[model samples]
Target: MTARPLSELVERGWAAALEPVADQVAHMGQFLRAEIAAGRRYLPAGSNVLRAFTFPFDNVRVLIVGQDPYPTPGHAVGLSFSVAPDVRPWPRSLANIFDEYTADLGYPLPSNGDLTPWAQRGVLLLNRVLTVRPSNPASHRGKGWEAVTECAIRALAARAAPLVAILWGRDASTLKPMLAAGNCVAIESPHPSPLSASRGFFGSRPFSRANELLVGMGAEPIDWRLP
Candidate 1:
């Protein structure tokens, strides 16, 4: 079954002020409806569908761009690179994120990879292409999410206060252009995937760096402690 209009996101406690991309969302639903009706969850369901948007437009202090959702069972929460607390063994990319957080911040790795704390603290943890099939990475790439996400990116750019943009890899780096000339601070480094993290992702201190920029903008630093 197709989902209710994306406009329901407003009533569902999403970033209601974000003007819904009426046509884009419908196209998204149309493109993914069959798989959705087949009960293959492409992402968190119900209100959780918009969990990443819980922060209001004005509340957003940082933007972290991820490429896509995890292609594993019980791992893809709406927040990028974040898993539900019960997900075990962690995704490789997520585990690497934990490593960098600890390495850069001098704190021990959080026992779990749930990044909800960061999300709640005004970090827009967004995946460029929000959904994918289990075990099939990029199944939904080139399917209109770029336009959808670009819309979100520019909206954040339009914010009165500049926000931090942490673009961690080639795919996420596409937004670097818009941010280059904006009030936002753009931080680009290698992806945290095990394959490329060593190239520069480690010791990059993205979390600390982003926090510094946030503080510079008069925004509160995120309490990255996971629950």
Candidate 2:
């Protein structure tokens, strides 16, 4: 019911990688379609349901698992913790991320919040639940999206190549056991939200640590800069 056909959403590498859970993904899509049809709104937009998957699955070198899309209008452009470049007064969590990013990388804060460059460089900015009802964070949890995204995570874990998972907050940290079962180097820290940033996120140096781990495994380091 969205602009693009459902088939196009999770096509290519993801389509094959998620074969076993294809049914669940499709079911979630149908459920979302119906939700929209009934006039209930979901964040990140329908066209971006599978945006994270659009990046080649086999090329994924890093994974950052966010809890869910930002429920604010025009904020969640599919990628976790990212907004369109033009979005003003970006999310506080993202601002903190940029702050930590600069501290770790020594680069000026980016002029924009869009993280598509990272995705292009094989960073999967995946949210546990891909969609949320506007003004209602985590409203889409327990829906079939969890099963589908978990399948994606397992797929990456099953790979022979190196992977670095940045687990922020208790929510993302919960996925560590699954990642530990694979060839993943996890960097755990408090989420880069103002509330908890001071606890461990501020000086955790996750960005630099991730690069060090990636390079040690012969994987290319992420630039971490949004252009």
Candidate 3:
């Protein structure tokens, strides 16, 4: 299903209703794109995943919150999550995470050949801080993006409910209070980066745990296997 354009959703009073947030989104998008391009930093095919806020905002049930975009190019399309099949290059961190998790579950990683499954399930992969490219080095690397991510979580709590939230990494865990206070079940794990996956990312394995919860809740779980 086609997600409602963020511009339209924001106008409808979805997180965009907050003046400061709306302005920040606009400024961040503009600045991030310009700097990344100017700095000649680019990721292979799916290097930079788009920093999406409340995608599929209205009917959202499962919310996967990630940190910033991959510090690569062609992957930061603002809305498309992950790489399109045609994109050849895969970021090492993403590829490793996919491999490790799938191996643990005895499944093969999805072919970067198609993103149809993720698209169809309507899994809302939202980056906490919407736009971070290679150009935006400081914001991507430091704690500066925390405030923005917190705002995104708040917005998610207010607008979407009865939703299972998967918080990936430290940045996501930081917002646990807000998520729990909002009466949402927040399952957190290490960032899916290879560096962290072995350390703790899979220790909790937020995705698998969330799926079990969803099944108990009567929601059909999306298959995490590659086609």
lDDT of 3 by residue, 145-186 (tens): 455556655666765345677655345446676676655454
Candidate 2 residue spans exceeding 4 A from truth: 1-7, 184-195
Residue 21 C-alpha lDDT in model 3: 57
Candidate with best lDDT = 2
For model 2, what is the C-alpha lDDT against the true structure?
A: 0.79
Better of 1 and 3 by lDDT: 1
The candidates, ranked best first by TM-score, are: 2, 1, 3
lDDT of 1 by residue, 1-227 (tens): 03665555533323344456657756776777767687775754434545676666677788888787778767887788888888888887888788887787778778787887787678888878877777788787888777777777776776668688777545644677756656656554544443367877777788888878788777778777664
How well does each candidate superpose onto the true structure, as a TM-score?
A: 0.86, 0.91, 0.67
Better of 2 and 3 by lDDT: 2
* TM-score quality measure for candidate 2: 0.91
Q: Supply candidate 3's per-residue lDDT for 69.
A: 60
Would you list the C-alpha lDDT of every candidate in the order shown? 0.71, 0.79, 0.53
